[PDB]
Amino acid sequence: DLLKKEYTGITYISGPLLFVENAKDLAYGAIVDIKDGTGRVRGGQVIEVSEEYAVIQVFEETTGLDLATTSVSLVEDVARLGVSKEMLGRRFNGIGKPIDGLPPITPEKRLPITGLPLNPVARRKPEQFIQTGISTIDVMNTLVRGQKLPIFSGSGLPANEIAAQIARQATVRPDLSGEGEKEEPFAVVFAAMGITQRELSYFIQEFERTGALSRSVLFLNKADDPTIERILTPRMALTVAEYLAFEHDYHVLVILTDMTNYCEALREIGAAREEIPGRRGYPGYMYTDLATIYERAGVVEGKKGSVTQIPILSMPDDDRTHPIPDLTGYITEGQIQLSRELHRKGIYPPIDPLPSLSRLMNNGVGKGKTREDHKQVSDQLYSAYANGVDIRKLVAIIGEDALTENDRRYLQFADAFERFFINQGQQNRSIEESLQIAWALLSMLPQGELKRISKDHIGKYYGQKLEEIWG
Amino acid sequence: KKEYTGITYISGPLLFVENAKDLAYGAIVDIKDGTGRVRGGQVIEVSEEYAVIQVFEETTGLDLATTSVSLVEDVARLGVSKEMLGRRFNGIGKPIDGLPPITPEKRLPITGLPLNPVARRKPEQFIQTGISTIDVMNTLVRGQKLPIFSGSGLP
Amino acid sequence: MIQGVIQKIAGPAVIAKGMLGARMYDICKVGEEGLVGEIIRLDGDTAFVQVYEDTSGLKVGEPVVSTGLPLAVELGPGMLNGIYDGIQRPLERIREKTGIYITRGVVVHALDREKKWAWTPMVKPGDEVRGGMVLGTVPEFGFTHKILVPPDVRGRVKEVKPAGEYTVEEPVVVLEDGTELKMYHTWPVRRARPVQRKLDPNTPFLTGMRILDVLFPVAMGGTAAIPGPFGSGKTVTQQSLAKWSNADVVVYVGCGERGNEMTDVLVEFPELTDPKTGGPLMHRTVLIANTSNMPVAAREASIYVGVTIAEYFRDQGFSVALMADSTSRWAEALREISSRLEEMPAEEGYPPYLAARLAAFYERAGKVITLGGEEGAVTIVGAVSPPGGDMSEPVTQSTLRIVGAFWRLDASLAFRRHFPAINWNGSYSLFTSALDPWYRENVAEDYPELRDAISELLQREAGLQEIVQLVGPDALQDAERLVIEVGRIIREDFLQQNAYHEVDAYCSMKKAYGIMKMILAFYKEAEAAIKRGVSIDEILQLPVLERIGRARYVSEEEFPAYFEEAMKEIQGAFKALA
Ligand SMILES: Nc1ncnc2c1ncn2[C@@H]1O[C@H](COP(=O)(O)OP(=O)(O)O)[C@@H](O)[C@H]1O
Ligand SMILES: [Mg+2]
């Protein structure tokens, strides 16, 4: 329709909720406009409708509202976002309004922000290897195009720097796969939820220096912005990413700054509505709500585009069993976990290899894709590093002077591994250099102890000395 | 005999029936629906306005229009006899071995009266269980309560 | 039938008024779009409906129509080589009616009405028919699909159709009472299909994994549970079981998990080979898919549909294996609905009736004599996803008290890339003593003795590890260092298995028996050598260790020569020490 209808008779305002009685004409999930007595207009959404009264959650703060003059008017029945190809290079707030001073976009379509589930028949397996330039990711936790790979961080760990480095250095290798094509760079969709100025300025300066702002769409919700707007931002960011990737064949990389703030914003609404909580007070439906965000990535059969997600989240008191990391690990296809101990020693990036995992690693590596010895080298490195870490605990009891000759080899291997393979700085290693370093690290062990590697590769790559690379 | 048809609420294992103040607390009732199937139930609360019944089995076929409730017995009772040696029962007294039901010498409430502490006497005789680790070191005496603590996969 | 109007909408729950006369658990049509619903609570003139589709955009006042029947599934030919959602709708035809996204209100039939099947009658006019008897035979992907009388239909045959090609809607047999029997029938998903008699379990369910087949066996009609934290190996193990097991028909239920896992099955299975028939592997598999971002209320329906289909294939004389990807999501969905019902919750917010549902789901398995006199079996393997790996969860504890086998996974083993990462200390199996008469006749006469010796060695190694943590490995005597090293060899050779390797992914029973025999022979020779005077540092450098340690990758057809060479090499190596 083209008319407008206003509902008066608000009977309850408290916190983020608002009740209106005679609003039975409002559809469930609709978007409404709340008009103040001074003319200010605020947004809202219906979360429960009945013939007795309707419940509306308010995005902005409730200061200045009164029960005598406030009125509620309908905007649209289903929350929709106007998208276009021209929003590349623009900046928007948490609810989609421009904040760069340019005039508003002209839509080509209006798409629901909640999205729709992808048909499992229409999906296809992600198999394209992506070279990030980090040895601990490229070799042992390989990332493929179309994967959801979050980063598990801490309070003082440099997760933002790692994400910026990955976005700067990411590329595919068509020469290894035999295609011979030259690709085009990823389009970036950046969604910030409760971000601070200290990190936002760093991200802006990094994107300005790398020149990636002309290919980027930014959704910013700052720390002093209203909390309830964080419900919408991931949905609109993923709607734009899906539209671009599956209508214009772009390769889209999506970064979400902090899902912990999103979970707190969800817990506020859940506690306001007296929902049955899960563990640590979070609402019981948080798994489904987190699933409606993560599973919007992947690849689609018969289409060139793709969506890749790199969420970032902070672990409270570095606890892996906290509900947010627990459900994120249950939903996503792996994780990258940073270590505080490696950070204290000065190692950058401080990626801990043992708790990290990549589920789609087997699809994108092997013969004809990267190299024939990738997986076995990764397995041998994992086993040897685990043995060295185990010996580190025996040393604290019996002393390192009482060790056998065999265990000292594992201890020195662990030390050299930490000091050379993980620690790389800002340099951009290729996959071949990372494999060369890995083979140079495996050469310090006896040839008969490489149980997980076939003799064919051992006879071809073993024997290279680490001083030949760094000397 | 008498049937109550004032059902007003069904949700999960509970149902409410109005004007049922004649039902004693803890009684056993039969729930009948339009298809003729009969289910069991127990009264868990009696009031002036309605009574609350916990339903055995499942409540798939029930509806508020045709459901009726009839009384079976006010107190859960079991018929006992010496014919029961060699029989199998399903946990509420119904045979499952295929033999005809026994004829009861008496009907007793399943909840038992406490023993008078001045009526007991000290246990003084043992039971041969045939297991050396129980017979020799942890002997079982007639009148003892000797539990067995086990794990999950233990036999 | 009863009609009403919507009174209140709140998420996945809809309350309709004017619903007097409706019955519990009936299927309703909600709104102008005709969304599928189910009544779960009656209160006066109102009814409480949960919706199996998204409820965004609905308005108060839309009509609600009750069908008067519970949820049911169509059972007949054409179910193999297909994928269904939570309420049995084919996804391959939703893929045609809609684009790459799944939308609301799509009405498709479970069985294709256009395809014609070659009908071959087996009954004659004048014959007495009864529930569970066969009416005819229809070929399907190398099988022989048998048309079955519905379980509660009795009568006498009036006329039958001659041999020919008909659709599933064609009435082939007409009874004297006027009832027509088609090529399919409908059955409520919450009623277990009746049988004649249950039977004891005496035949093992071969999985292809050494540790599960040898140490913790499960019988053909048994049940098992595999709990563990995220990243421990539950899905890979279940898919390996789907690939390599000896079941005739495999039913897979993706209750609330990722969609890429179902995509992998849809893509890779048509290229694999059925082990016992030689055809494509997907021709024996039925998939039920309800991913994480699908509507919440359909998770229970997927489980019930899967178990009902698995029982339907049981009645035809097949042995069916049913895999449940996660039974914890079912409990979470129950908790989410219980939140919308405002009822009193249990220990961790779950409804109190959760254990009854879990018990009723698991007790549908077992080996039976069907109503037609044939023999069938259904075995259920269900995964559990505890929050944070806490095994004291109510769902984990409820499952522990009804299953026959328990395969606990460990995160510490998965961290060091030791797979299948089965925790030997916390796992058990109750079918071990009943399968011995099969093992003695089909594998070897001394196989249970070898298995018990291996278990004793593992127990002794587990006993010594408390001292190694206390005073270090070097303080032990050589006779105990031998036990420690043999335990390490067993752990790194026999128990470890790679599911993605070209050869090691599948292992027969005789190969595992040969490996166990080689390990025990080496241990006996080493124990004899220590008392003679040889230091242990001499023994564990013999080249026969590499011969033992790489026997995993030897192919099945080449193993008998390798075994006979290694057994001679053991004696050749151990006589030259002292
Ligand atoms: N038998 C095995 N052989 C080799 N790798 C395995 C095996 N089992 C599990 N894995 C590895 O462990 C990971 C576990 O992933 P998955 O089983 O999908 O998740 P979850 O167990 O949390 O459902 C997989 O990515 C796989 O690479
Ligand atoms: Mg899984």
Within an 8 Å CB–CB cutoff, is residue C266 touching chain B? no
Q: Which three-class secondary structure string do you get for chain A?
A: CCCCCEECCEEEEECCEEEECCCCCCCCCCEEEEECCCCCEEEEEEEEEECCCEEEEECCCCCCCCCCCCEEEEEECCCEEEECCCCCCCEECCCCCECCCCCCCCCCEEEECCCCCECCCCECCCCCEEECCCHHHHCCCCCECCCECCEEECCCCCHHHHHHHHHHHCEECHHHHCCCCCCCCCEEEEEEEEECHHHHHHHHHHHHHHCCHHHEEEEEEECCCCHHHHHCHHHHHHHHHHHHHHHHCCEEEEEECCHHHHHHHHHHHHHHCCCCECHHHCECCHHHHHHHHHCCCEEECCCCCEEEEEEEEECHHHCCCCHHHHHHHHHCCEEEEECHHHHHCCCCCCECCCCCEECCHHHHCECCCCECCHHHHHHHHHHHHHHHHHHHHHHHHHCHHHCCHHHHHHHHHHHHHHHHHHCCCCCCCCHHHHHHHHHHHHCCCCHHHCCCCCHHHHHHHCCCCHHHCCC
**DSSP for residue C6:** E
Quick one: angle between helices C354-362 and C328-340, nearest 10? Answer: 140
User: Residue B13 is nearest to which of C21, C42, C353, comparing CB atoms?
Assistant: C353
The string over A282-315, giving b where at least 16 C-beta atoms fall within 10 Å of a residue's C-beta and e elsewhere, is bbbbbbbebbbbbbbbbbbeeeebbbbbbbbbbb
Closest C-alpha among A49, A55, A53 to residue A16: A55
Q: Provide the greatest CA pair distance for chain B.
A: 66
**Across-strand partners of A35?**
A41, A71
In this structure, how many other beta carbons lie within 10 angstroms of the beta carbon of residue C525? 18
Closest C-alpha among C130, C136, C168, C142 to residue C81: C142
- Give the 3-state secondary structure of residue C546: helix
Q: Strand runs (DSSP E) across chain B, as ranges?
A: 3-4, 7-11, 14-18, 28-32, 38-46, 50-55, 68-73, 77-80, 106-109, 126-127, 140-141
User: Cα C282 to the chain's mean position, in Å?
Assistant: 16
The residues near C165 (Cβ < 8 Å, ≥ 6 apart) are C116, C117, C118, C119
Take residue A384 and report the two structure tokens written for it. Answer: 């040897």
Take residue C320 and report the two structure tokens written for it. Answer: 């069916």
Distances (CA, A) of C440 to C211, C213, C507, C560, C573: 19, 15, 19, 20, 31
- Give the 3-state secondary structure of residue C83: strand
Q: What are phi and psi of C258, to 5 degrees?
A: -70, 155
Name residue A112's amino acid.
Answer: P
Take residue A43 and report the two structure tokens written for it. Answer: 């947004």
Taking the alpha carbons at both ends of chain B, their separation in whole angstroms is 49
Q: Is the peptide bond before C420 cis (omega within 30 degrees of 0)?
A: yes
Is residue B32 within 8 Å of B70, Cβ to Cβ?
A: yes
Q: Which pairs from A436-441 meet CB under 8 Å and 24+ separation? A: A436/A464, A436/A469, A437/A135, A437/A466, A437/A469, A438/A135, A438/A139, A438/A377, A438/A381, A439/A377, A439/A464, A440/A464, A440/A465, A440/A466, A440/A468, A440/A469, A441/A381, A441/A413, A441/A416, A441/A417, A441/A466
Distances (CA, A) of C134 to C131, C216, C249, C315: 9, 38, 19, 10
Per the listing, tokens 């309850």 go with A12
Take residue C284 and report the two structure tokens written for it. Answer: 């024996």
The DSSP annotation for A286-300 comes to HHHHHHHHHTT-EEB
Query: Do the strands A151-153 and A334-337 form a parallel or antiparallel pair, or are they unpaired?
Result: parallel
Is residue B58 within 8 Å of B44, Cβ to Cβ?
A: no
CA-nearest residue, atom 10 of ligand 1: C233
Closest C-alpha among C251, C212, C287, C285 to residue C364: C251
Q: Which three-class secondary structure string do you get for A140-191?
A: CCCCECCCECCEEECCCCCHHHHHHHHHHHCEECHHHHCCCCCCCCCEEEEE
CA distance A123 to C264: 10
Is residue A280 within 8 Å of A323, Cβ to Cβ?
A: yes
C-beta C420 within 6 A of ligand 1: yes
Q: From edge to edge, which strands make up the β-sheet containing C155-160?
A: C128-129, C155-160, C173-175, C180-181
Q: What share of chain A is helix, strand, coil (3-state, %, to 5)?
A: 35, 25, 40
Name residue B122's amino acid.
Answer: K
In this structure, how many other beta carbons lie within 10 angstroms of the beta carbon of residue A39? 6
Question: Do the chains contact at A117 and C267, CB–CB below 8 Å?
Answer: no
User: Cα B49 to the chain's mean position, in Å?
Assistant: 27
CA of C233, nearest ligand number: 1
In this structure, how many other beta carbons lie within 10 angstroms of the beta carbon of residue B34? 13
Helices and strands (H, E) in chain C, number of each type: 16, 26
**Ligand 1 mutation target, pool C236, C381, C417, C502, most atoms within 8 A of CB:** C236
Closest C-alpha among A403, C31, C30 to residue C39: C30
Name residue C55's amino acid.
Answer: T
Size of interface B-C (CB pairs under 8 A): 51
**The residue count for chain B:** 155
CA distance A418 to C86: 48
Within an 8 Å CB–CB cutoff, is residue C385 touching chain A? yes
Q: What are phi and psi of A48, to 5 degrees?
A: -160, 125
Is residue C363 within 8 Å of C402, Cβ to Cβ?
A: yes
CA distance C384 to A357: 20
Residue C193 burial class via C-beta count within 10 angstroms: exposed 0-12, middle 13-18, buried 19 and up:
buried
Distances (CA, A) of C407 to A330, C383, C483: 19, 10, 25
CA-nearest residue, atom 21 of ligand 1: C233
Question: Do the chains contact at B152 and C428, CB–CB below 8 Å?
Answer: yes
Measured at the alpha carbon of residue C300, what is the angle toward residues C228 and C65, in degrees to the nearest 5? 165
Per the listing, tokens 């519990």 go with C24
Within an 8 Å CB–CB cutoff, is residue C91 touching chain A? yes
**DSSP for residue C76:** S
Q: Which pairs from C349-352 meet CB under 8 Å and 24+ separation? A: C349/A276, C349/A277, C349/A278, C349/A284, C350/C394, C350/C395, C351/B12
CA of A329, nearest ligand number: 1
**Across-strand partners of C384?**
C227
Within an 8 Å CB–CB cutoff, is residue B12 touching chain C? yes
CA distance C66 to C44: 17
Take residue A350 and report the two structure tokens written for it. Answer: 């401080």
Instruction: Give the residue on C whose Cα is nearest the Cα of A398.
Output: C472
**DSSP for residue A88:** T
C-beta C101 within 6 A of ligand 1: no
Is residue A241 within 8 Å of A176, Cβ to Cβ?
A: no
CA distance C63 to C34: 9
The DSSP annotation for B111-150 comes to SPPPPPTTT------EE--S-HHHHTTSPEETT-------
Q: What are phi and psi of C379, to 5 degrees?
A: -120, 135
Is residue C309 within 8 Å of C79, Cβ to Cβ?
A: yes
H or E segment to which residue A413 belongs = helix A405-417
CA distance C52 to C33: 13
Is residue C394 within 8 Å of C156, Cβ to Cβ?
A: no
**Across-strand partners of A220?**
A192
Handedness of CA A258, A263, A268, A269 (dihedral sign): positive
CA distance A25 to A9: 14
User: Residue A27 is nearest to which of C57, C289, C339, comparing CB atoms?
Assistant: C57
Query: Do the strands A306-314 and A251-256 form a parallel or antiparallel pair, or are they unpaired?
Result: parallel
Q: What are phi and psi of A420, to 5 degrees?
A: -120, -45
Closest C-alpha among B91, B47, B43, B98 to residue B70: B43
Is residue A178 within 8 Å of A368, Cβ to Cβ?
A: yes
User: Cα A391 to the chain's mean position, in Å?
Assistant: 35
Helix ranges (H only) for C129-244 are 210-214, 234-244
**Across-strand partners of A131?**
A171
CA Rg, chain A, in Å?
A: 26
Is residue C366 within 8 Å of C353, Cβ to Cβ?
A: no
The DSSP annotation for C290-343 comes to E-TTS-TTHHHHHHHHHHHHHHHHHTTT-EEEEEES-SHHHHHHHHHHHHHTT-
Do C and B touch, 3+ Cβ pairs within 8 Å? The answer is yes
Closest C-alpha among A398, A431, A428, A400 to residue A414: A400
CA distance C13 to C23: 17
Is residue C386 within 8 Å of C463, Cβ to Cβ?
A: no
Measured at the alpha carbon of residue C357, what is the angle toward residues C356 and C359, in degrees to the nearest 5? 65
Within an 8 Å CB–CB cutoff, is residue B5 touching chain C? no
Is C437 a known ligand-binding residue?
no
- Chain C, residues 138-177, CB within 8 A of chain A, namely none
**DSSP for residue C14:** E
Is residue A17 within 8 Å of A9, Cβ to Cβ?
A: no
- Give the 3-state secondary structure of residue C49: strand
Which resolution, in Å, applies to this structure?
A: 2.8
Is residue B11 within 8 Å of B30, Cβ to Cβ?
A: no
Q: What are phi and psi of A287, to 5 degrees?
A: -65, -50
Region class of C99: left (phi > 0), else alpha (psi between -120 and 50), else beta: beta
The residues near B130 (Cβ < 8 Å, ≥ 6 apart) are none
CA distance B11 to B56: 13
In this structure, how many other beta carbons lie within 10 angstroms of the beta carbon of residue C330? 24
Query: Do the strands C366-369 and C185-188 form a parallel or antiparallel pair, or are they unpaired?
Result: unpaired
Name residue A364's amino acid.
Answer: G
CA distance B101 to A392: 72
**DSSP for residue C356:** H
Query: Do the strands C134-140 and B77-80 form a parallel or antiparallel pair, or are they unpaired?
Result: unpaired
**The residue count for chain A:** 471
Q: Which three-class secondary structure string do you get for C458-478?
A: HHHHHHHHHHHHHHCHHHCCH
CA Rg, chain B, in Å?
A: 22
Is residue C41 within 8 Å of B10, Cβ to Cβ?
A: yes
Measured at the alpha carbon of residue C310, what is the angle toward residues C306 and C315, in degrees to the nearest 5? 150
CA-nearest residue, atom 24 of ligand 1: A359
Take residue C379 and report the two structure tokens written for it. Answer: 């075995």
H or E segment to which residue B62 belongs = none
**The residue count for chain C:** 578
Within an 8 Å CB–CB cutoff, is residue C353 touching chain B? yes
The residues near A169 (Cβ < 8 Å, ≥ 6 apart) are A131, A132, A133, A134, A428
Closest C-alpha among A359, A286, A292 to residue A327: A286
In this structure, how many other beta carbons lie within 10 angstroms of the beta carbon of residue C385? 25
In this structure, how many other beta carbons lie within 10 angstroms of the beta carbon of residue C479? 11
Query: With contacts defined as CB-CB under 8 Å, which chain C residues touch A121?
Result: 83, 91-92, 95, 266
What dihedral do alpha carbons A306, A288, A119, A47 form, nearest 10°? -100
CA distance C478 to A361: 43
Query: With contacts defined as CB-CB under 8 Å, which chain C residues touch B12?
Result: 41, 343, 351, 353
Closest C-alpha among C402, C365, C399 to residue C385: C399
| Elucidation technique | cryo-EM
User: Residue B11 is nearest to which of C21, C41, C429, comparing CB atoms?
Assistant: C41
Q: How many Å lie between the alpha carbon of A213 and the closest alpha carbon of chain C?
A: 31
User: Residue C21 is nearest to which of B8, B12, B65, comparing CB atoms?
Assistant: B65
CA distance B76 to C228: 44
Closest C-alpha among A162, A256, A164 to residue A204: A164
- Give the 3-state secondary structure of residue B63: strand
Query: With contacts defined as CB-CB under 8 Å, which chain A residues touch C16?
Result: none
Is C234 a known ligand-binding residue?
yes
Q: Provide the greatest CA pair distance for chain C.
A: 94
- In chain C, residues preceding a discontinuity (C to N beyond 2.5 A) are none
Within an 8 Å CB–CB cutoff, is residue A287 touching chain C? yes
CA of residue A342 to ligand 1 center, whole Å: 27
- Give the 3-state secondary structure of residue A455: helix
Instruction: Give the residue on A whose Cα is nearest the Cα of C234.
Output: A330
CA distance A361 to A144: 7
- Give the 3-state secondary structure of residue C201: coil
User: Cα C461 to the chain's mean position, in Å?
Assistant: 33
Question: Do the chains contact at B60 and C41, CB–CB below 8 Å?
Answer: no
Handedness of CA C51, C56, C59, C63 (dihedral sign): negative
- Give the 3-state secondary structure of residue A42: strand
Name residue C412's amino acid.
Answer: S
Q: Is the peptide bond before A349 cis (omega within 30 degrees of 0)?
A: yes
Question: Do the chains contact at A295 and C259, CB–CB below 8 Å?
Answer: yes
CA distance A205 to A342: 27
CA of residue A374 to ligand 2 center, whole Å: 24
